[PDB]
Enzyme design. Structure first.
Site, PDB file in Angstrom:
ATOM      1  CB  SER A   1      -6.260  13.500  -1.773  1.00 17.19           C
ATOM      2  OG  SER A   1      -7.561  13.864  -1.372  1.00 17.19           O
TER       3      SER A   1
ATOM      4  CE  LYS B   1     -12.603  25.005   1.927  1.00 18.62           C
ATOM      5  NZ  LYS B   1     -11.749  26.213   2.173  1.00 18.62           N
ATOM      6  CG  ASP B   2     -14.193  21.113  -1.320  1.00 13.59           C
ATOM      7  OD1 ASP B   2     -13.819  22.291  -1.544  1.00 13.59           O
ATOM      8  OD2 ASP B   2     -13.436  20.241  -0.881  1.00 13.59           O
TER       9      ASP B   2
ATOM     10  CB  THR C   1      -4.032  32.521  -0.160  1.00 15.03           C
ATOM     11  OG1 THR C   1      -5.344  31.949  -0.286  1.00 15.03           O
ATOM     12  CG2 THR C   1      -4.065  33.971  -0.577  1.00 15.03           C
TER      13      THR C   1
ATOM     14  CB  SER D   1      -8.740  31.147  -1.066  1.00 13.55           C
ATOM     15  OG  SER D   1      -9.963  31.791  -0.697  1.00 13.55           O
ATOM     16  CG  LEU D   2     -10.484  33.969  -6.587  1.00 14.43           C
ATOM     17  CD1 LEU D   2     -11.500  34.240  -7.679  1.00 14.43           C
ATOM     18  CD2 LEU D   2      -9.126  34.584  -6.941  1.00 14.43           C
ATOM     19  NE  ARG D   3     -13.119  31.687   1.718  1.00 17.14           N
ATOM     20  CZ  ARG D   3     -12.348  31.459   2.787  1.00 17.14           C
ATOM     21  NH1 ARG D   3     -12.304  32.360   3.791  1.00 17.14           N
ATOM     22  NH2 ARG D   3     -11.625  30.345   2.848  1.00 17.14           N
ATOM     23  NE  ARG D   4      -8.393  30.331   3.350  1.00 19.13           N
ATOM     24  CZ  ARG D   4      -8.394  29.026   3.119  1.00 19.13           C
ATOM     25  NH1 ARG D   4      -7.799  28.524   2.038  1.00 19.13           N
ATOM     26  NH2 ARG D   4      -9.018  28.228   3.942  1.00 19.13           N
TER      27      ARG D   4
ATOM     28  NE  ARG E   1       4.292  25.072  -8.464  1.00 17.98           N
ATOM     29  CZ  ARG E   1       4.863  26.189  -8.910  1.00 17.98           C
ATOM     30  NH1 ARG E   1       4.123  27.135  -9.483  1.00 17.98           N
ATOM     31  NH2 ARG E   1       6.175  26.363  -8.783  1.00 17.98           N
ATOM     32  N   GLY E   2      -0.184  23.280  -4.968  1.00 14.83           N
ATOM     33  CA  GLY E   2       0.177  22.008  -4.375  1.00 14.83           C
ATOM     34  C   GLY E   2      -0.710  21.655  -3.198  1.00 14.83           C
ATOM     35  CG  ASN E   3      -0.208  17.733  -1.448  1.00 15.82           C
ATOM     36  OD1 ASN E   3       0.874  18.320  -1.340  1.00 15.82           O
ATOM     37  ND2 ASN E   3      -0.305  16.416  -1.428  1.00 15.82           N
TER      38      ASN E   3
ATOM     39  CB  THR F   1       3.265  20.495  -2.248  1.00 12.92           C
ATOM     40  OG1 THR F   1       3.084  19.118  -2.601  1.00 12.92           O
ATOM     41  CG2 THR F   1       4.222  21.167  -3.239  1.00 12.92           C
ATOM     42  NE  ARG F   2      -1.632  25.026  -1.456  1.00 11.16           N
ATOM     43  CZ  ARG F   2      -2.734  25.734  -1.710  1.00 11.16           C
ATOM     44  NH1 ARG F   2      -3.128  26.722  -0.907  1.00 11.16           N
ATOM     45  NH2 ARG F   2      -3.456  25.434  -2.779  1.00 11.16           N
TER      46      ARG F   2
ATOM     47  CB  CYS G   1     -17.590  28.376  -9.226  1.00  9.81           C
ATOM     48  SG  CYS G   1     -18.943  27.264  -9.387  1.00  9.81           S
TER      49      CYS G   1
HETATM   50  C1  LIG Z   1     -20.166  27.339  -8.118  1.00  7.70           C
HETATM   51  C2  LIG Z   1     -19.588  26.583  -6.904  1.00  7.70           C
HETATM   52  N1  LIG Z   1     -18.676  25.500  -6.889  1.00  7.70           N
HETATM   53  C3  LIG Z   1     -18.445  25.083  -5.550  1.00  7.70           C
HETATM   54  C4  LIG Z   1     -17.488  23.943  -5.128  1.00  7.70           C
HETATM   55  C5  LIG Z   1     -16.217  24.663  -4.657  1.00  7.70           C
HETATM   56  N2  LIG Z   1     -15.938  25.047  -3.368  1.00  7.70           N
HETATM   57  C6  LIG Z   1     -14.724  25.679  -3.306  1.00  7.70           C
HETATM   58  C7  LIG Z   1     -14.184  26.231  -2.027  1.00  7.70           C
HETATM   59  C8  LIG Z   1     -12.737  25.875  -1.712  1.00  7.70           C
HETATM   60  N3  LIG Z   1     -12.230  24.554  -1.564  1.00  7.70           N
HETATM   61  C9  LIG Z   1     -10.868  24.619  -1.244  1.00  7.70           C
HETATM   62  C10 LIG Z   1     -10.003  23.370  -0.978  1.00  7.70           C
HETATM   63  C11 LIG Z   1     -10.407  22.809   0.411  1.00  7.70           C
HETATM   64  N4  LIG Z   1     -11.613  22.104   0.661  1.00  7.70           N
HETATM   65  C12 LIG Z   1     -11.683  21.732   2.040  1.00  7.70           C
HETATM   66  C13 LIG Z   1     -10.522  22.207   2.648  1.00  7.70           C
HETATM   67  C14 LIG Z   1     -10.224  21.996   4.143  1.00  7.70           C
HETATM   68  C15 LIG Z   1     -11.248  22.913   4.850  1.00  7.70           C
HETATM   69  C16 LIG Z   1     -12.675  22.335   4.911  1.00  7.70           C
HETATM   70  O1  LIG Z   1     -12.898  21.067   4.907  1.00  7.70           O
HETATM   71  O2  LIG Z   1     -13.621  23.181   4.987  1.00  7.70           O
HETATM   72  C17 LIG Z   1      -9.715  22.879   1.646  1.00  7.70           C
HETATM   73  C18 LIG Z   1      -8.324  23.486   1.852  1.00  7.70           C
HETATM   74  C19 LIG Z   1      -8.299  24.773   2.665  1.00  7.70           C
HETATM   75  O3  LIG Z   1      -9.273  25.563   2.592  1.00  7.70           O
HETATM   76  O4  LIG Z   1      -7.295  25.027   3.394  1.00  7.70           O
HETATM   77  C20 LIG Z   1     -10.536  25.996  -1.199  1.00  7.70           C
HETATM   78  C21 LIG Z   1      -9.183  26.626  -0.880  1.00  7.70           C
HETATM   79  C22 LIG Z   1      -8.273  26.702  -2.105  1.00  7.70           C
HETATM   80  C23 LIG Z   1      -6.890  27.200  -1.646  1.00  7.70           C
HETATM   81  O5  LIG Z   1      -6.618  27.346  -0.420  1.00  7.70           O
HETATM   82  O6  LIG Z   1      -6.004  27.460  -2.499  1.00  7.70           O
HETATM   83  C24 LIG Z   1     -11.702  26.773  -1.476  1.00  7.70           C
HETATM   84  C25 LIG Z   1     -11.746  28.317  -1.572  1.00  7.70           C
HETATM   85  C26 LIG Z   1     -12.008  29.088  -0.276  1.00  7.70           C
HETATM   86  O7  LIG Z   1     -12.071  28.516   0.858  1.00  7.70           O
HETATM   87  O8  LIG Z   1     -12.205  30.336  -0.343  1.00  7.70           O
HETATM   88  C27 LIG Z   1     -14.169  25.738  -4.595  1.00  7.70           C
HETATM   89  C28 LIG Z   1     -12.835  26.405  -4.961  1.00  7.70           C
HETATM   90  C29 LIG Z   1     -11.634  25.466  -5.040  1.00  7.70           C
HETATM   91  C30 LIG Z   1     -10.363  26.331  -5.199  1.00  7.70           C
HETATM   92  O9  LIG Z   1     -10.425  27.600  -5.179  1.00  7.70           O
HETATM   93  O10 LIG Z   1      -9.241  25.767  -5.310  1.00  7.70           O
HETATM   94  C31 LIG Z   1     -15.157  25.078  -5.474  1.00  7.70           C
HETATM   95  C32 LIG Z   1     -15.129  24.770  -6.971  1.00  7.70           C
HETATM   96  C33 LIG Z   1     -14.727  25.951  -7.813  1.00  7.70           C
HETATM   97  O11 LIG Z   1     -15.120  27.119  -7.479  1.00  7.70           O
HETATM   98  O12 LIG Z   1     -14.012  25.716  -8.831  1.00  7.70           O
HETATM   99  C34 LIG Z   1     -19.202  25.937  -4.730  1.00  7.70           C
HETATM  100  C35 LIG Z   1     -19.342  25.952  -3.182  1.00  7.70           C
HETATM  101  C36 LIG Z   1     -18.462  26.977  -2.450  1.00  7.70           C
HETATM  102  C37 LIG Z   1     -18.861  27.007  -0.952  1.00  7.70           C
HETATM  103  O13 LIG Z   1     -19.976  26.555  -0.611  1.00  7.70           O
HETATM  104  O14 LIG Z   1     -18.114  27.504  -0.058  1.00  7.70           O
HETATM  105  C38 LIG Z   1     -19.919  26.835  -5.579  1.00  7.70           C
HETATM  106  C39 LIG Z   1     -20.838  27.940  -5.099  1.00  7.70           C
HETATM  107  C40 LIG Z   1     -22.248  27.957  -5.659  1.00  7.70           C
HETATM  108  O15 LIG Z   1     -22.918  26.897  -5.774  1.00  7.70           O
HETATM  109  O16 LIG Z   1     -22.716  29.080  -5.991  1.00  7.70           O
END
Ligand SMILES: *Cc1[nH]c(Cc2[nH]c(Cc3[nH]c(Cc4[nH]cc(CCC(=O)O)c4CC(=O)O)c(CCC(=O)O)c3CC(=O)O)c(CCC(=O)O)c2CC(=O)O)c(CCC(=O)O)c1CC(=O)O
Length: 323
Positions: A10, A63-64, A110, A112-115, A132-134, A137-138, A226
Protein backbone atom coordinates in the site's frame (compact mmCIF):
# COMPACT_ATOMS: atom_id res chain seq x y z
CA UNK A 1 26.10 -7.47 2.00
CA UNK A 2 22.78 -5.90 1.00
CA UNK A 3 20.12 -4.95 3.57
CA UNK A 4 16.71 -6.26 2.49
CA UNK A 5 13.75 -4.11 3.59
CA UNK A 6 10.33 -5.75 3.26
CA UNK A 7 7.20 -3.64 2.78
CA UNK A 8 3.48 -3.91 2.31
CA UNK A 9 2.42 -2.72 -1.13
CA UNK A 10 0.00 0.00 0.00
CA UNK A 11 1.06 3.54 -0.77
CA UNK A 12 1.46 4.85 2.74
CA UNK A 13 3.50 1.80 3.81
CA UNK A 14 5.81 2.31 0.81
CA UNK A 15 6.25 6.01 1.62
CA UNK A 16 7.03 5.17 5.24
CA UNK A 17 9.53 2.50 4.17
CA UNK A 18 11.24 4.91 1.73
CA UNK A 19 11.66 7.56 4.42
CA UNK A 20 13.33 5.14 6.85
CA UNK A 21 15.60 3.79 4.10
CA UNK A 22 16.61 7.36 3.27
CA UNK A 23 17.67 7.99 6.87
CA UNK A 24 19.62 4.72 6.91
CA UNK A 25 21.44 5.68 3.69
CA UNK A 26 22.39 9.03 5.26
CA UNK A 27 24.24 7.20 8.07
CA UNK A 28 25.45 4.39 5.80
CA UNK A 29 26.24 5.81 2.33
CA UNK A 30 28.47 2.80 1.58
CA UNK A 31 25.66 0.20 2.06
CA UNK A 32 23.11 -1.24 -0.39
CA UNK A 33 19.42 -1.31 0.63
CA UNK A 34 16.88 -3.24 -1.44
CA UNK A 35 13.13 -2.74 -1.01
CA UNK A 36 11.01 -5.88 -1.30
CA UNK A 37 7.27 -5.38 -1.67
CA UNK A 38 5.07 -8.38 -1.03
CA UNK A 39 -3.98 -5.94 8.24
CA UNK A 40 -2.89 -8.21 11.10
CA UNK A 41 -2.57 -10.83 8.34
CA UNK A 42 0.02 -8.74 6.48
CA UNK A 43 1.82 -8.03 9.75
CA UNK A 44 2.22 -11.78 10.13
CA UNK A 45 3.24 -12.17 6.46
CA UNK A 46 6.05 -9.69 6.96
CA UNK A 47 7.02 -11.43 10.20
CA UNK A 48 7.20 -14.74 8.31
CA UNK A 49 9.43 -13.14 5.68
CA UNK A 50 11.62 -11.93 8.46
CA UNK A 51 11.66 -15.32 10.26
CA UNK A 52 12.75 -17.01 7.02
CA UNK A 53 15.55 -14.50 6.31
CA UNK A 54 13.77 -13.25 3.19
CA UNK A 55 14.08 -9.70 4.60
CA UNK A 56 16.15 -8.05 7.31
CA UNK A 57 13.78 -5.33 8.57
CA UNK A 58 10.24 -4.07 8.16
CA UNK A 59 8.81 -0.58 8.74
CA UNK A 60 5.46 -0.09 10.50
CA UNK A 61 3.56 2.78 11.99
CA UNK A 62 4.22 2.18 15.69
CA UNK A 63 0.55 2.35 16.66
CA UNK A 64 0.00 -0.61 14.41
CA UNK A 65 2.30 -2.87 16.46
CA UNK A 66 0.76 -4.69 19.46
CA UNK A 67 2.44 -4.21 22.82
CA UNK A 68 3.35 -7.92 22.85
CA UNK A 69 5.25 -9.10 19.77
CA UNK A 70 5.69 -12.78 18.89
CA UNK A 71 8.94 -14.20 20.19
CA UNK A 72 11.78 -13.89 17.77
CA UNK A 73 10.88 -10.35 16.71
CA UNK A 74 11.56 -7.04 18.31
CA UNK A 75 11.28 -3.33 17.53
CA UNK A 76 14.87 -2.30 16.84
CA UNK A 77 14.30 1.42 16.17
CA UNK A 78 11.76 4.05 17.25
CA UNK A 79 12.24 6.94 14.78
CA UNK A 80 11.82 10.59 15.69
CA UNK A 81 8.12 11.21 16.09
CA UNK A 82 6.24 13.04 13.35
CA UNK A 83 3.10 15.06 14.21
CA UNK A 84 0.98 12.74 16.44
CA UNK A 85 -2.30 14.74 16.19
CA UNK A 86 -5.62 13.71 14.77
CA UNK A 87 -6.98 16.01 12.06
CA UNK A 88 -10.21 16.84 10.23
CA UNK A 89 -10.82 17.04 6.48
CA UNK A 90 -14.03 18.92 5.61
CA UNK A 91 -16.50 18.46 2.77
CA UNK A 92 -15.68 21.14 0.15
CA UNK A 93 -18.89 23.07 0.75
CA UNK A 94 -17.68 23.77 4.29
CA UNK A 95 -15.25 26.62 3.68
CA UNK A 96 -13.36 27.46 6.84
CA UNK A 97 -15.52 25.51 9.23
CA UNK A 98 -14.50 23.56 12.29
CA UNK A 99 -16.22 20.68 14.03
CA UNK A 100 -17.58 23.29 16.47
CA UNK A 101 -19.32 25.16 13.65
CA UNK A 102 -20.72 22.33 11.51
CA UNK A 103 -24.54 22.24 11.39
CA UNK A 104 -26.10 19.99 13.98
CA UNK A 105 -26.54 16.36 12.85
CA UNK A 106 -23.64 16.65 10.38
CA UNK A 107 -22.10 13.19 9.85
CA UNK A 108 -18.38 12.75 10.53
CA UNK A 109 -16.61 9.69 9.18
CA UNK A 110 -14.29 7.70 11.41
CA UNK A 111 -13.67 3.98 11.92
CA UNK A 112 -11.59 4.54 15.09
CA UNK A 113 -13.36 3.62 18.32
CA UNK A 114 -10.94 5.92 20.08
CA UNK A 115 -11.69 8.98 17.94
CA UNK A 116 -15.43 8.29 17.86
CA UNK A 117 -15.62 7.98 21.66
CA UNK A 118 -13.76 11.20 22.40
CA UNK A 119 -15.42 13.23 19.64
CA UNK A 120 -18.98 12.14 20.49
CA UNK A 121 -18.28 13.34 24.02
CA UNK A 122 -16.88 16.67 22.86
CA UNK A 123 -19.40 17.21 20.01
CA UNK A 124 -22.77 15.73 21.07
CA UNK A 125 -24.63 17.49 18.23
CA UNK A 126 -22.67 15.71 15.48
CA UNK A 127 -23.05 12.13 14.30
CA UNK A 128 -19.92 9.97 14.10
CA UNK A 129 -20.14 7.09 11.68
CA UNK A 130 -17.90 4.40 10.19
CA UNK A 131 -16.30 5.05 6.82
CA UNK A 132 -14.51 2.41 4.74
CA UNK A 133 -11.57 2.58 2.35
CA UNK A 134 -8.05 3.84 2.11
CA UNK A 135 -7.29 7.53 2.31
CA UNK A 136 -7.82 8.15 -1.41
CA UNK A 137 -11.22 6.45 -1.22
CA UNK A 138 -12.39 8.38 1.86
CA UNK A 139 -11.40 11.66 0.21
CA UNK A 140 -13.33 10.70 -2.96
CA UNK A 141 -16.43 9.85 -0.89
CA UNK A 142 -16.13 13.24 0.78
CA UNK A 143 -15.64 15.18 -2.47
CA UNK A 144 -18.23 13.37 -4.61
CA UNK A 145 -21.07 12.29 -2.29
CA UNK A 146 -23.21 14.01 0.32
CA UNK A 147 -23.24 11.50 3.18
CA UNK A 148 -20.25 12.90 5.12
CA UNK A 149 -19.55 16.47 6.20
CA UNK A 150 -16.02 15.70 7.39
CA UNK A 151 -13.67 12.80 8.11
CA UNK A 152 -11.13 12.22 10.89
CA UNK A 153 -7.62 10.93 10.28
CA UNK A 154 -4.03 11.17 11.47
CA UNK A 155 -2.23 14.32 10.35
CA UNK A 156 0.92 12.30 9.76
CA UNK A 157 -0.77 10.13 7.15
CA UNK A 158 -1.78 13.18 5.08
CA UNK A 159 1.64 14.76 5.64
CA UNK A 160 3.42 11.70 4.22
CA UNK A 161 1.13 11.74 1.13
CA UNK A 162 2.12 15.36 0.41
CA UNK A 163 -1.51 16.30 1.16
CA UNK A 164 -1.13 18.45 4.29
CA UNK A 165 -3.10 21.13 2.46
CA UNK A 166 -6.25 19.02 2.77
CA UNK A 167 -6.24 19.49 6.58
CA UNK A 168 -8.92 21.85 7.86
CA UNK A 169 -8.55 21.41 11.64
CA UNK A 170 -5.92 19.88 13.92
CA UNK A 171 -7.54 18.38 17.02
CA UNK A 172 -6.13 19.24 20.43
CA UNK A 173 -5.97 16.80 23.39
CA UNK A 174 -9.13 18.16 25.05
CA UNK A 175 -10.97 17.32 21.80
CA UNK A 176 -9.17 14.05 20.90
CA UNK A 177 -5.98 12.62 22.42
CA UNK A 178 -3.93 10.45 20.05
CA UNK A 179 -3.46 6.70 19.87
CA UNK A 180 -0.51 5.07 21.64
CA UNK A 181 2.40 5.25 19.16
CA UNK A 182 0.64 7.54 16.64
CA UNK A 183 3.09 9.56 14.53
CA UNK A 184 6.20 7.42 15.32
CA UNK A 185 7.51 4.75 12.91
CA UNK A 186 8.90 1.49 14.28
CA UNK A 187 11.32 -0.89 12.58
CA UNK A 188 10.73 -4.57 13.34
CA UNK A 189 13.62 -7.07 13.06
CA UNK A 190 14.64 -10.52 14.23
CA UNK A 191 15.02 -10.45 18.03
CA UNK A 192 18.49 -12.04 18.01
CA UNK A 193 19.96 -10.68 14.73
CA UNK A 194 22.71 -8.55 16.29
CA UNK A 195 24.12 -7.13 13.02
CA UNK A 196 20.75 -5.72 11.97
CA UNK A 197 19.90 -4.48 15.48
CA UNK A 198 23.18 -2.53 15.67
CA UNK A 199 22.54 -1.19 12.16
CA UNK A 200 19.00 0.14 12.74
CA UNK A 201 19.80 1.38 16.25
CA UNK A 202 21.13 4.55 14.62
CA UNK A 203 17.46 5.40 13.95
CA UNK A 204 16.41 5.44 17.63
CA UNK A 205 15.36 8.91 18.78
CA UNK A 206 15.84 8.95 22.57
CA UNK A 207 12.93 11.31 23.31
CA UNK A 208 10.50 9.49 21.08
CA UNK A 209 11.74 6.16 22.46
CA UNK A 210 11.06 7.07 26.07
CA UNK A 211 7.66 8.64 25.30
CA UNK A 212 6.57 5.56 23.42
CA UNK A 213 7.85 3.09 26.01
CA UNK A 214 5.67 4.90 28.52
CA UNK A 215 2.64 5.02 26.19
CA UNK A 216 3.03 1.37 25.32
CA UNK A 217 3.64 0.22 28.91
CA UNK A 218 0.46 2.03 29.93
CA UNK A 219 -1.59 0.39 27.22
CA UNK A 220 -0.20 -3.10 27.89
CA UNK A 221 -0.88 -2.91 31.64
CA UNK A 222 -4.50 -1.90 31.05
CA UNK A 223 -4.91 -5.27 29.25
CA UNK A 224 -7.97 -4.04 27.37
CA UNK A 225 -7.54 -6.13 24.26
CA UNK A 226 -7.46 -4.60 20.82
CA UNK A 227 -9.86 -1.80 19.86
CA UNK A 228 -11.13 -0.34 23.04
CA UNK A 229 -11.02 3.46 23.33
CA UNK A 230 -7.67 4.32 24.96
CA UNK A 231 -5.69 7.49 24.31
CA UNK A 232 -2.53 9.26 25.53
CA UNK A 233 -0.52 12.49 25.52
CA UNK A 234 3.23 12.62 26.37
CA UNK A 235 5.68 15.47 26.67
CA UNK A 236 9.27 15.74 27.84
CA UNK A 237 10.15 19.13 29.28
CA UNK A 238 12.51 20.37 31.99
CA UNK A 239 13.70 16.93 33.02
CA UNK A 240 10.18 15.50 33.39
CA UNK A 241 8.27 12.98 31.36
CA UNK A 242 4.50 13.71 31.42
CA UNK A 243 1.99 10.94 30.56
CA UNK A 244 -1.75 11.55 30.37
CA UNK A 245 -3.91 8.53 29.65
CA UNK A 246 -7.61 7.97 29.35
CA UNK A 247 -10.20 5.30 28.63
CA UNK A 248 -13.75 5.90 27.35
CA UNK A 249 -17.00 4.05 26.78
CA UNK A 250 -17.87 3.65 23.11
CA UNK A 251 -20.19 6.71 23.17
CA UNK A 252 -17.75 8.75 25.26
CA UNK A 253 -20.18 9.25 28.17
CA UNK A 254 -18.06 7.30 30.71
CA UNK A 255 -14.39 8.19 30.97
CA UNK A 256 -11.43 8.13 33.34
CA UNK A 257 -8.38 10.22 32.58
CA UNK A 258 -5.31 11.03 34.72
CA UNK A 259 -1.79 12.44 34.32
CA UNK A 260 1.43 11.27 35.99
CA UNK A 261 5.02 12.44 35.62
CA UNK A 262 8.54 11.24 36.44
CA UNK A 263 12.01 12.80 36.53
CA UNK A 264 13.61 11.32 33.42
CA UNK A 265 16.57 12.93 31.66
CA UNK A 266 16.65 12.60 27.86
CA UNK A 267 20.01 10.87 27.18
CA UNK A 268 22.08 12.72 24.59
CA UNK A 269 24.93 10.19 24.30
CA UNK A 270 24.91 6.68 22.88
CA UNK A 271 26.31 4.01 25.19
CA UNK A 272 27.41 0.45 24.47
CA UNK A 273 24.83 -1.45 26.53
CA UNK A 274 24.70 -5.17 27.30
CA UNK A 275 23.15 -7.75 24.99
CA UNK A 276 21.41 -9.85 27.68
CA UNK A 277 19.08 -6.89 28.34
CA UNK A 278 15.49 -8.02 27.66
CA UNK A 279 13.27 -5.92 25.45
CA UNK A 280 10.85 -3.43 27.05
CA UNK A 281 7.26 -3.54 25.68
CA UNK A 282 8.64 -5.10 22.53
CA UNK A 283 11.46 -2.55 22.00
CA UNK A 284 15.24 -3.27 21.94
CA UNK A 285 17.45 -0.18 22.42
CA UNK A 286 20.89 -1.36 23.54
CA UNK A 287 22.63 1.85 22.49
CA UNK A 288 20.46 4.08 24.74
CA UNK A 289 20.99 4.11 28.55
CA UNK A 290 18.68 1.55 30.11
CA UNK A 291 17.78 3.43 33.29
CA UNK A 292 15.55 6.03 31.65
CA UNK A 293 13.88 3.31 29.62
CA UNK A 294 12.87 1.32 32.71
CA UNK A 295 11.69 4.53 34.38
CA UNK A 296 9.47 5.33 31.33
CA UNK A 297 8.06 1.83 31.49
CA UNK A 298 7.39 2.21 35.26
CA UNK A 299 5.55 5.48 34.61
CA UNK A 300 3.17 3.80 32.18
CA UNK A 301 2.48 0.88 34.56
CA UNK A 302 1.88 3.35 37.39
CA UNK A 303 -0.63 5.45 35.46
CA UNK A 304 -2.38 2.29 34.32
CA UNK A 305 -2.69 1.02 37.92
CA UNK A 306 -4.17 4.36 38.95
CA UNK A 307 -6.80 4.17 36.20
CA UNK A 308 -7.61 0.59 37.14
CA UNK A 309 -8.06 1.68 40.77
CA UNK A 310 -10.63 4.23 39.58
CA UNK A 311 -12.65 1.70 37.57
CA UNK A 312 -11.04 1.45 34.09
CA UNK A 313 -11.38 -2.31 33.80
CA UNK A 314 -15.19 -2.11 33.81
CA UNK A 315 -15.18 0.59 31.13
CA UNK A 316 -12.83 -1.47 28.95
CA UNK A 317 -14.76 -4.70 29.50
CA UNK A 318 -18.06 -3.12 28.44
CA UNK A 319 -16.46 -1.36 25.46
CA UNK A 320 -14.73 -4.56 24.32
CA UNK A 321 -17.91 -6.61 24.39
CA UNK A 322 -20.02 -3.94 22.63
CA UNK A 323 -17.60 -3.13 19.75
C1 LIG B 1 -4.39 -5.59 20.73
C2 LIG B 1 -3.69 -4.58 19.80
N1 LIG B 1 -3.53 -4.63 18.40
C3 LIG B 1 -2.79 -3.50 17.95
C4 LIG B 1 -2.44 -3.19 16.48
C5 LIG B 1 -3.45 -2.13 16.06
N2 LIG B 1 -3.28 -0.77 16.13
C6 LIG B 1 -4.39 -0.11 15.69
C7 LIG B 1 -4.48 1.38 15.69
C8 LIG B 1 -4.99 2.02 14.40
N3 LIG B 1 -4.37 1.88 13.12
C9 LIG B 1 -5.09 2.62 12.18
C10 LIG B 1 -4.69 2.73 10.70
C11 LIG B 1 -3.44 3.64 10.62
N4 LIG B 1 -2.14 3.24 11.01
C12 LIG B 1 -1.22 4.32 10.82
C13 LIG B 1 -1.95 5.39 10.31
C14 LIG B 1 -1.30 6.74 9.96
C15 LIG B 1 -0.94 7.34 11.34
C16 LIG B 1 0.33 6.74 11.98
O1 LIG B 1 1.28 6.25 11.27
O2 LIG B 1 0.39 6.78 13.25
C17 LIG B 1 -3.33 4.99 10.18
C18 LIG B 1 -4.47 5.82 9.59
C19 LIG B 1 -4.94 6.98 10.47
O3 LIG B 1 -4.90 6.85 11.72
O4 LIG B 1 -5.38 8.03 9.92
C20 LIG B 1 -6.16 3.23 12.89
C21 LIG B 1 -7.25 4.16 12.35
C22 LIG B 1 -8.41 3.39 11.73
C23 LIG B 1 -9.36 4.41 11.07
O5 LIG B 1 -9.05 5.64 10.99
O6 LIG B 1 -10.46 4.03 10.60
C24 LIG B 1 -6.09 2.86 14.27
C25 LIG B 1 -7.10 3.27 15.36
C26 LIG B 1 -6.84 4.59 16.10
O7 LIG B 1 -5.91 5.38 15.76
O8 LIG B 1 -7.56 4.87 17.10
C27 LIG B 1 -5.36 -1.05 15.32
C28 LIG B 1 -6.77 -0.72 14.80
C29 LIG B 1 -6.93 -0.71 13.29
C30 LIG B 1 -8.34 -0.15 12.96
O9 LIG B 1 -9.11 0.26 13.88
O10 LIG B 1 -8.71 -0.07 11.76
C31 LIG B 1 -4.74 -2.37 15.57
C32 LIG B 1 -5.26 -3.79 15.32
C33 LIG B 1 -6.65 -4.01 15.84
O11 LIG B 1 -7.01 -3.46 16.93
O12 LIG B 1 -7.41 -4.76 15.15
C34 LIG B 1 -2.50 -2.74 19.10
C35 LIG B 1 -1.71 -1.41 19.23
C36 LIG B 1 -2.56 -0.14 19.30
C37 LIG B 1 -1.65 1.07 19.63
O13 LIG B 1 -0.52 0.86 20.13
O14 LIG B 1 -2.01 2.27 19.44
C38 LIG B 1 -3.03 -3.43 20.23
C39 LIG B 1 -2.97 -2.94 21.66
C40 LIG B 1 -2.38 -3.89 22.69
O15 LIG B 1 -1.34 -4.56 22.44
O16 LIG B 1 -2.98 -3.96 23.80
Amino acid sequence: RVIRVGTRKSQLARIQTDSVVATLKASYPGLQFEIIAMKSLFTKELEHALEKNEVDLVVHSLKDLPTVLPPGFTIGAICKRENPHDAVVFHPKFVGKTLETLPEKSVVGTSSLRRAAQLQRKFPHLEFRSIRGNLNTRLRKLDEQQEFSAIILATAGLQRMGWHNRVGQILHPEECMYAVGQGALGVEVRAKDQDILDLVGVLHDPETLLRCIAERAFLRHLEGGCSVPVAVHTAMKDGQLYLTGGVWSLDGSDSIQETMQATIHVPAQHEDGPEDDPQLVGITARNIPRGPQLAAQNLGISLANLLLSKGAKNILDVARQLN
